[PDB]
Amino acid sequence: NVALVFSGPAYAAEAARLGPAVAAAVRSPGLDVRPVALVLNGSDPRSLVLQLCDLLSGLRVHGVVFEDDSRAPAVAPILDFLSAQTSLPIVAVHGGAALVLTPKEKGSTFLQLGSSTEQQLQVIFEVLEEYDWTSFVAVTTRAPGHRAFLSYIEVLTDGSLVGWEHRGALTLDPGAGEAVLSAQLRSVSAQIRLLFCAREEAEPVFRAAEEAGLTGSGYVWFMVGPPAGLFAVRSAGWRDDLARRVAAGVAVVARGAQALLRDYGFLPELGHDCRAQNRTHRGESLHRYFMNITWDNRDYSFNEDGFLVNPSLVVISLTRDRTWEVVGSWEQQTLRLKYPLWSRYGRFLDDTQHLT
Amino acid sequence: IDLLIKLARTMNFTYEVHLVADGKFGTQERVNNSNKKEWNGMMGELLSG
Amino acid sequence: KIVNIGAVLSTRKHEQMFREAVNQANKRHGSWKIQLNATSVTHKPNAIQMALSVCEDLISSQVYAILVSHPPTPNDHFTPTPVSYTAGFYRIPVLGLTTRMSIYSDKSIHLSFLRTVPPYSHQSSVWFEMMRVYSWNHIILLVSDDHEGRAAQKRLETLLEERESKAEKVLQFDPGTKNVTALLMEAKELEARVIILSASEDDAATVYRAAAMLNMTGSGYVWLVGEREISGNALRYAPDGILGLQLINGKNESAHISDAVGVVAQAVHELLEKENITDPPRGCVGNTNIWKTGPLFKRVLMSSKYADGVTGRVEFNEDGDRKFANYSIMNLQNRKLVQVGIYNGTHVIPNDRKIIWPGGETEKPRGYQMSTRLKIVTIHQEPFVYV
């Protein structure tokens, strides 16, 4: 018995078909899965906690997978607390709840089927050295955690034998102006400008690239946060399509209680009650499980916070036809990718100083 | 060790000599964990405390 | 047309005192159409009903800023936790009072959350001003392994490397302490005698019992204790010479509210311009959009200068915290606290009454006390060090 939540009217039709699609997808003796179709819509903080409390009280639904049409992260905080209130794990596979909300509240069972920006920063760290782009300018915008987002860059820089460069003096916002930001953007060390930016600020910075001449292939960006030749990593954003997103989402959740079940015979009735009991301290083993759960020949292990540690990350290179395709993968530090890495000076990318 | 004894006779402090553990004088080298350089031998024993 | 704000106070009895802060909307700048309607509501007993009523009862009154007070029950930011989550999606600035929790500081979790009282994290900043005028350099401390307790841990060393040669020991103890004695003898060799407590009140009481059988509360010691870890069980079994601190505006809300509402209605005055001044998204059946005037006036509120109230020093940093607040560190003297100083950007230490130390001594002791025993490392080297 599981509950599937949808955010977006366009996904209402898929609810009926996606129900049976996962009932027979994962087979585990001793437990039966009964997906629950939902009708609610809207991001307002009323139906988010309304039907969920009713579903928990009567249906006793264990395992919730979150799919959202938009990338807005404002839906996660409302759902984040409800995971801690009911002490039941909740996973999100696609939509707004992709960025990891840190630091989470104490005793929070919220989980996300995506890689954190720290994991995102680590995988792209390999790309620059693999293609010999060690020099670059650090660029970011006014973000809630941009100070911490660039903090990991400092740890990444000067690490190992490779010598890297970072600026960290960019606070992209429309108040400065595109030309002024371009003037601040001229403080550069190479043709690469690693940029952390949000979907709200994506449009203002997109035009600033045109003013600074970054549209051409000579100068390229690097989008790490949620113009041509722009590099990005979606952390399997386009992977799993639609069916595999929910099929693998519940397999880890269903197998999570197996460790407790094999330890002793106990059925956690925490999810069967939402309000009939006026107590909030009835929570235990919130993160005691979930160490070595694997599926789809991949390590589905989650950190203490509740995000993937070894995910099936993918590399996204912006194509000229406004299409995003997988151009690389990170599977246990395997950077074979495609488009042979020799390349250089004629693909992807001062004669008075450089001469063959 | 005689120069050590004359040292203790001047500053009026006690001691308990213990030999080094690994057996190397000391050289700052990078551990297998990326390039976090860490000393060894006497220098490791002194910086650690 | 009409400017209205809401608030989440403690009890309905104190709600009537909040109306005195909204009916006075006439005596502000401009006063063209400033007619504040409180529309306040007592906080629900639990957090479940907060989300079931915030959308259609508080926000629906076309409110723009929310005042949140500490619940009377001994909770851990129970009232503002879902309110910040609900208002975070709606992009509604909220003003906090009497909420000294340091986890409400990162903008990723609570982008829209500003409080008029600095949390326990800012205690360590004021603490740095104490040994500067008390002549100690070496320093060790023990702290709980939780975000609230550990908040002071990254606060001290960020302002200690430029004024000191690092704390000698920064050892930490698990908050779920159960007769944890092995963590004290392992720290009783640095000869610091200047230990600092930045733990929870219950745990700070627990370590006090463990600090008796080996007499770490005798002469030659000085202890720094946070405000949260003084009253209650932490007062019992504590050393006589506790140098803890408190807050002048402790359990004070009307003064905080009056200073608050002085800036809630103020920021709206300069808001009136040719730019987008649309109201927050009304309605609750369907709401996904974000009003674009939220962040526009948020900086104005943060940058607003209010020279009224407690010395007119309600200043805001990049986070929502009071600046240059007066903490006025206490001093335990025979199971009761006395006043010895105050902080006004620079610590002020009036004579007032004598300052005592653990063991009953009055003269401030040098915490070093030296260490005659010394540890020595050699190696086999035939001409020099035979073996």
PDB file of N, CA and C in Angstrom, chain A residues 192-258:
ATOM      1  N   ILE A 192      36.114  29.497 -19.804  1.00  0.00           N
ATOM      2  CA  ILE A 192      35.086  28.803 -19.037  1.00  0.00           C
ATOM      3  C   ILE A 192      34.657  29.692 -17.880  1.00  0.00           C
ATOM      4  N   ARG A 193      33.344  29.860 -17.720  1.00  0.00           N
ATOM      5  CA  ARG A 193      32.759  30.624 -16.618  1.00  0.00           C
ATOM      6  C   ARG A 193      31.739  29.725 -15.923  1.00  0.00           C
ATOM      7  N   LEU A 194      32.187  29.008 -14.896  1.00  0.00           N
ATOM      8  CA  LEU A 194      31.288  28.171 -14.112  1.00  0.00           C
ATOM      9  C   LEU A 194      30.280  29.053 -13.386  1.00  0.00           C
ATOM     10  N   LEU A 195      28.996  28.834 -13.656  1.00  0.00           N
ATOM     11  CA  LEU A 195      27.926  29.685 -13.154  1.00  0.00           C
ATOM     12  C   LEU A 195      26.924  28.867 -12.353  1.00  0.00           C
ATOM     13  N   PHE A 196      26.617  29.336 -11.147  1.00  0.00           N
ATOM     14  CA  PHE A 196      25.496  28.830 -10.368  1.00  0.00           C
ATOM     15  C   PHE A 196      24.363  29.844 -10.470  1.00  0.00           C
ATOM     16  N   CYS A 197      23.195  29.386 -10.911  1.00  0.00           N
ATOM     17  CA  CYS A 197      22.075  30.284 -11.142  1.00  0.00           C
ATOM     18  C   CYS A 197      20.775  29.515 -10.966  1.00  0.00           C
ATOM     19  N   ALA A 198      19.704  30.259 -10.716  1.00  0.00           N
ATOM     20  CA  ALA A 198      18.380  29.689 -10.525  1.00  0.00           C
ATOM     21  C   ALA A 198      17.528  29.889 -11.775  1.00  0.00           C
ATOM     22  N   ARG A 199      16.403  29.172 -11.818  1.00  0.00           N
ATOM     23  CA  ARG A 199      15.502  29.289 -12.960  1.00  0.00           C
ATOM     24  C   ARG A 199      14.895  30.682 -13.054  1.00  0.00           C
ATOM     25  N   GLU A 200      14.656  31.332 -11.913  1.00  0.00           N
ATOM     26  CA  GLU A 200      14.156  32.703 -11.930  1.00  0.00           C
ATOM     27  C   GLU A 200      15.169  33.650 -12.563  1.00  0.00           C
ATOM     28  N   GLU A 201      16.450  33.465 -12.256  1.00  0.00           N
ATOM     29  CA  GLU A 201      17.510  34.331 -12.752  1.00  0.00           C
ATOM     30  C   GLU A 201      18.119  33.844 -14.060  1.00  0.00           C
ATOM     31  N   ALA A 202      17.612  32.746 -14.627  1.00  0.00           N
ATOM     32  CA  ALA A 202      18.173  32.232 -15.872  1.00  0.00           C
ATOM     33  C   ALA A 202      17.961  33.207 -17.025  1.00  0.00           C
ATOM     34  N   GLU A 203      16.770  33.809 -17.111  1.00  0.00           N
ATOM     35  CA  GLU A 203      16.505  34.753 -18.197  1.00  0.00           C
ATOM     36  C   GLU A 203      17.378  36.001 -18.118  1.00  0.00           C
ATOM     37  N   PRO A 204      17.508  36.689 -16.972  1.00  0.00           N
ATOM     38  CA  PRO A 204      18.366  37.890 -16.953  1.00  0.00           C
ATOM     39  C   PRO A 204      19.813  37.620 -17.331  1.00  0.00           C
ATOM     40  N   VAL A 205      20.367  36.475 -16.929  1.00  0.00           N
ATOM     41  CA  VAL A 205      21.753  36.176 -17.275  1.00  0.00           C
ATOM     42  C   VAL A 205      21.890  35.671 -18.705  1.00  0.00           C
ATOM     43  N   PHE A 206      20.828  35.094 -19.277  1.00  0.00           N
ATOM     44  CA  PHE A 206      20.891  34.637 -20.661  1.00  0.00           C
ATOM     45  C   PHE A 206      21.143  35.800 -21.612  1.00  0.00           C
ATOM     46  N   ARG A 207      20.468  36.930 -21.387  1.00  0.00           N
ATOM     47  CA  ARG A 207      20.690  38.102 -22.226  1.00  0.00           C
ATOM     48  C   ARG A 207      22.054  38.727 -21.969  1.00  0.00           C
ATOM     49  N   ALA A 208      22.548  38.653 -20.730  1.00  0.00           N
ATOM     50  CA  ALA A 208      23.859  39.213 -20.417  1.00  0.00           C
ATOM     51  C   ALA A 208      24.970  38.500 -21.177  1.00  0.00           C
ATOM     52  N   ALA A 209      24.779  37.217 -21.494  1.00  0.00           N
ATOM     53  CA  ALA A 209      25.763  36.501 -22.300  1.00  0.00           C
ATOM     54  C   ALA A 209      25.859  37.093 -23.699  1.00  0.00           C
ATOM     55  N   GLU A 210      24.725  37.516 -24.261  1.00  0.00           N
ATOM     56  CA  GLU A 210      24.734  38.135 -25.582  1.00  0.00           C
ATOM     57  C   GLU A 210      25.512  39.445 -25.573  1.00  0.00           C
ATOM     58  N   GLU A 211      25.341  40.251 -24.520  1.00  0.00           N
ATOM     59  CA  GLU A 211      26.048  41.524 -24.440  1.00  0.00           C
ATOM     60  C   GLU A 211      27.548  41.330 -24.257  1.00  0.00           C
ATOM     61  N   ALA A 212      27.956  40.277 -23.554  1.00  0.00           N
ATOM     62  CA  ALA A 212      29.365  40.013 -23.301  1.00  0.00           C
ATOM     63  C   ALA A 212      30.017  39.166 -24.386  1.00  0.00           C
ATOM     64  N   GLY A 213      29.280  38.804 -25.434  1.00  0.00           N
ATOM     65  CA  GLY A 213      29.849  38.000 -26.495  1.00  0.00           C
ATOM     66  C   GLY A 213      30.047  36.543 -26.150  1.00  0.00           C
ATOM     67  N   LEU A 214      29.349  36.041 -25.135  1.00  0.00           N
ATOM     68  CA  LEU A 214      29.471  34.653 -24.713  1.00  0.00           C
ATOM     69  C   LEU A 214      28.578  33.711 -25.509  1.00  0.00           C
ATOM     70  N   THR A 215      27.787  34.235 -26.449  1.00  0.00           N
ATOM     71  CA  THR A 215      26.928  33.376 -27.259  1.00  0.00           C
ATOM     72  C   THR A 215      27.752  32.436 -28.131  1.00  0.00           C
ATOM     73  N   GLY A 216      28.857  32.928 -28.681  1.00  0.00           N
ATOM     74  CA  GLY A 216      29.683  32.119 -29.552  1.00  0.00           C
ATOM     75  C   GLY A 216      30.405  31.011 -28.810  1.00  0.00           C
ATOM     76  N   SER A 217      30.928  30.065 -29.593  1.00  0.00           N
ATOM     77  CA  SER A 217      31.637  28.921 -29.036  1.00  0.00           C
ATOM     78  C   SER A 217      32.990  29.290 -28.441  1.00  0.00           C
ATOM     79  N   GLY A 218      33.480  30.508 -28.683  1.00  0.00           N
ATOM     80  CA  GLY A 218      34.755  30.907 -28.109  1.00  0.00           C
ATOM     81  C   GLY A 218      34.729  30.945 -26.593  1.00  0.00           C
ATOM     82  N   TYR A 219      33.655  31.482 -26.019  1.00  0.00           N
ATOM     83  CA  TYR A 219      33.478  31.546 -24.575  1.00  0.00           C
ATOM     84  C   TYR A 219      32.287  30.685 -24.187  1.00  0.00           C
ATOM     85  N   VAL A 220      32.489  29.803 -23.211  1.00  0.00           N
ATOM     86  CA  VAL A 220      31.467  28.856 -22.789  1.00  0.00           C
ATOM     87  C   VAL A 220      31.227  29.012 -21.296  1.00  0.00           C
ATOM     88  N   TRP A 221      29.989  28.758 -20.888  1.00  0.00           N
ATOM     89  CA  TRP A 221      29.593  28.808 -19.492  1.00  0.00           C
ATOM     90  C   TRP A 221      29.638  27.409 -18.885  1.00  0.00           C
ATOM     91  N   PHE A 222      29.153  27.296 -17.651  1.00  0.00           N
ATOM     92  CA  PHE A 222      29.033  26.002 -16.986  1.00  0.00           C
ATOM     93  C   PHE A 222      27.959  26.149 -15.919  1.00  0.00           C
ATOM     94  N   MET A 223      26.785  25.571 -16.165  1.00  0.00           N
ATOM     95  CA  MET A 223      25.636  25.736 -15.282  1.00  0.00           C
ATOM     96  C   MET A 223      25.603  24.583 -14.285  1.00  0.00           C
ATOM     97  N   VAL A 224      25.874  24.887 -13.020  1.00  0.00           N
ATOM     98  CA  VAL A 224      25.817  23.901 -11.951  1.00  0.00           C
ATOM     99  C   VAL A 224      24.507  23.989 -11.177  1.00  0.00           C
ATOM    100  N   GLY A 225      24.010  25.201 -10.946  1.00  0.00           N
ATOM    101  CA  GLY A 225      22.748  25.392 -10.275  1.00  0.00           C
ATOM    102  C   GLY A 225      21.572  25.042 -11.163  1.00  0.00           C
ATOM    103  N   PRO A 226      20.375  24.936 -10.568  1.00  0.00           N
ATOM    104  CA  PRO A 226      19.153  24.582 -11.301  1.00  0.00           C
ATOM    105  C   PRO A 226      18.760  25.635 -12.334  1.00  0.00           C
ATOM    106  N   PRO A 227      22.841  32.319 -25.553  1.00  0.00           N
ATOM    107  CA  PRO A 227      24.015  31.586 -25.067  1.00  0.00           C
ATOM    108  C   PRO A 227      24.087  30.163 -25.614  1.00  0.00           C
ATOM    109  N   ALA A 228      25.256  29.781 -26.123  1.00  0.00           N
ATOM    110  CA  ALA A 228      25.472  28.456 -26.682  1.00  0.00           C
ATOM    111  C   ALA A 228      26.700  27.828 -26.038  1.00  0.00           C
ATOM    112  N   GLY A 229      26.781  26.506 -26.136  1.00  0.00           N
ATOM    113  CA  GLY A 229      27.879  25.776 -25.525  1.00  0.00           C
ATOM    114  C   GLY A 229      27.878  25.824 -24.012  1.00  0.00           C
ATOM    115  N   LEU A 230      26.708  25.693 -23.392  1.00  0.00           N
ATOM    116  CA  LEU A 230      26.587  25.753 -21.942  1.00  0.00           C
ATOM    117  C   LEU A 230      26.603  24.343 -21.368  1.00  0.00           C
ATOM    118  N   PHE A 231      27.460  24.122 -20.377  1.00  0.00           N
ATOM    119  CA  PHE A 231      27.615  22.820 -19.747  1.00  0.00           C
ATOM    120  C   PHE A 231      26.762  22.738 -18.488  1.00  0.00           C
ATOM    121  N   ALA A 232      26.219  21.549 -18.237  1.00  0.00           N
ATOM    122  CA  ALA A 232      25.374  21.337 -17.071  1.00  0.00           C
ATOM    123  C   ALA A 232      25.342  19.855 -16.733  1.00  0.00           C
ATOM    124  N   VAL A 233      24.943  19.564 -15.498  1.00  0.00           N
ATOM    125  CA  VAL A 233      24.710  18.200 -15.039  1.00  0.00           C
ATOM    126  C   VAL A 233      23.353  18.176 -14.352  1.00  0.00           C
ATOM    127  N   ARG A 234      22.445  17.347 -14.857  1.00  0.00           N
ATOM    128  CA  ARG A 234      21.096  17.253 -14.318  1.00  0.00           C
ATOM    129  C   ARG A 234      20.947  16.154 -13.275  1.00  0.00           C
ATOM    130  N   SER A 235      21.990  15.359 -13.044  1.00  0.00           N
ATOM    131  CA  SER A 235      21.952  14.234 -12.109  1.00  0.00           C
ATOM    132  C   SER A 235      20.803  13.286 -12.452  1.00  0.00           C
ATOM    133  N   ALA A 236      20.897  12.702 -13.651  1.00  0.00           N
ATOM    134  CA  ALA A 236      19.870  11.807 -14.185  1.00  0.00           C
ATOM    135  C   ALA A 236      18.508  12.496 -14.242  1.00  0.00           C
ATOM    136  N   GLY A 237      18.510  13.775 -14.622  1.00  0.00           N
ATOM    137  CA  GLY A 237      17.258  14.505 -14.734  1.00  0.00           C
ATOM    138  C   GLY A 237      16.357  13.962 -15.825  1.00  0.00           C
ATOM    139  N   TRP A 238      16.925  13.669 -16.993  1.00  0.00           N
ATOM    140  CA  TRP A 238      16.167  13.103 -18.101  1.00  0.00           C
ATOM    141  C   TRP A 238      16.088  11.583 -18.053  1.00  0.00           C
ATOM    142  N   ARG A 239      16.803  10.946 -17.131  1.00  0.00           N
ATOM    143  CA  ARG A 239      16.780   9.497 -17.024  1.00  0.00           C
ATOM    144  C   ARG A 239      15.471   9.031 -16.388  1.00  0.00           C
ATOM    145  N   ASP A 240      15.187   7.737 -16.552  1.00  0.00           N
ATOM    146  CA  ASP A 240      14.043   7.016 -15.994  1.00  0.00           C
ATOM    147  C   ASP A 240      12.723   7.372 -16.668  1.00  0.00           C
ATOM    148  N   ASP A 241      12.711   8.327 -17.601  1.00  0.00           N
ATOM    149  CA  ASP A 241      11.505   8.723 -18.322  1.00  0.00           C
ATOM    150  C   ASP A 241      10.364   9.059 -17.369  1.00  0.00           C
ATOM    151  N   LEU A 242       9.326   8.231 -17.360  1.00  0.00           N
ATOM    152  CA  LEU A 242       8.207   8.401 -16.440  1.00  0.00           C
ATOM    153  C   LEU A 242       7.901   7.148 -15.633  1.00  0.00           C
ATOM    154  N   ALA A 243       7.977   5.966 -16.251  1.00  0.00           N
ATOM    155  CA  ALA A 243       7.638   4.737 -15.539  1.00  0.00           C
ATOM    156  C   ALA A 243       8.717   4.354 -14.534  1.00  0.00           C
ATOM    157  N   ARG A 244       9.988   4.434 -14.936  1.00  0.00           N
ATOM    158  CA  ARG A 244      11.078   4.040 -14.051  1.00  0.00           C
ATOM    159  C   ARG A 244      11.250   5.003 -12.884  1.00  0.00           C
ATOM    160  N   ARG A 245      10.751   6.236 -13.010  1.00  0.00           N
ATOM    161  CA  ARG A 245      10.873   7.202 -11.924  1.00  0.00           C
ATOM    162  C   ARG A 245      10.165   6.713 -10.667  1.00  0.00           C
ATOM    163  N   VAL A 246       8.963   6.164 -10.821  1.00  0.00           N
ATOM    164  CA  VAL A 246       8.199   5.684  -9.677  1.00  0.00           C
ATOM    165  C   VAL A 246       8.474   4.209  -9.386  1.00  0.00           C
ATOM    166  N   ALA A 247       8.801   3.418 -10.413  1.00  0.00           N
ATOM    167  CA  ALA A 247       9.061   1.998 -10.200  1.00  0.00           C
ATOM    168  C   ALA A 247      10.260   1.780  -9.284  1.00  0.00           C
ATOM    169  N   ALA A 248      11.347   2.520  -9.510  1.00  0.00           N
ATOM    170  CA  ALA A 248      12.516   2.410  -8.648  1.00  0.00           C
ATOM    171  C   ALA A 248      12.395   3.250  -7.384  1.00  0.00           C
ATOM    172  N   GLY A 249      11.448   4.187  -7.343  1.00  0.00           N
ATOM    173  CA  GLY A 249      11.286   5.011  -6.156  1.00  0.00           C
ATOM    174  C   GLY A 249      10.777   4.228  -4.959  1.00  0.00           C
ATOM    175  N   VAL A 250       9.851   3.297  -5.190  1.00  0.00           N
ATOM    176  CA  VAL A 250       9.282   2.516  -4.100  1.00  0.00           C
ATOM    177  C   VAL A 250      10.101   1.270  -3.777  1.00  0.00           C
ATOM    178  N   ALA A 251      10.925   0.793  -4.715  1.00  0.00           N
ATOM    179  CA  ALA A 251      11.702  -0.419  -4.474  1.00  0.00           C
ATOM    180  C   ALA A 251      12.655  -0.244  -3.298  1.00  0.00           C
ATOM    181  N   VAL A 252      13.328   0.905  -3.222  1.00  0.00           N
ATOM    182  CA  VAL A 252      14.194   1.177  -2.079  1.00  0.00           C
ATOM    183  C   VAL A 252      13.366   1.333  -0.809  1.00  0.00           C
ATOM    184  N   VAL A 253      12.232   2.035  -0.899  1.00  0.00           N
ATOM    185  CA  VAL A 253      11.391   2.253   0.276  1.00  0.00           C
ATOM    186  C   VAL A 253      10.831   0.933   0.788  1.00  0.00           C
ATOM    187  N   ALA A 254      10.354   0.078  -0.121  1.00  0.00           N
ATOM    188  CA  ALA A 254       9.840  -1.224   0.288  1.00  0.00           C
ATOM    189  C   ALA A 254      10.936  -2.079   0.912  1.00  0.00           C
ATOM    190  N   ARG A 255      12.130  -2.068   0.320  1.00  0.00           N
ATOM    191  CA  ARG A 255      13.250  -2.832   0.853  1.00  0.00           C
ATOM    192  C   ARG A 255      13.868  -2.198   2.092  1.00  0.00           C
ATOM    193  N   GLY A 256      13.529  -0.945   2.399  1.00  0.00           N
ATOM    194  CA  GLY A 256      14.081  -0.310   3.584  1.00  0.00           C
ATOM    195  C   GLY A 256      13.629  -0.973   4.871  1.00  0.00           C
ATOM    196  N   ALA A 257      12.344  -1.324   4.955  1.00  0.00           N
ATOM    197  CA  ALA A 257      11.816  -1.988   6.140  1.00  0.00           C
ATOM    198  C   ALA A 257      12.223  -3.453   6.228  1.00  0.00           C
ATOM    199  N   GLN A 258      12.828  -4.006   5.174  1.00  0.00           N
ATOM    200  CA  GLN A 258      13.254  -5.401   5.209  1.00  0.00           C
ATOM    201  C   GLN A 258      14.319  -5.628   6.274  1.00  0.00           C
TER     202      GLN A 258
END
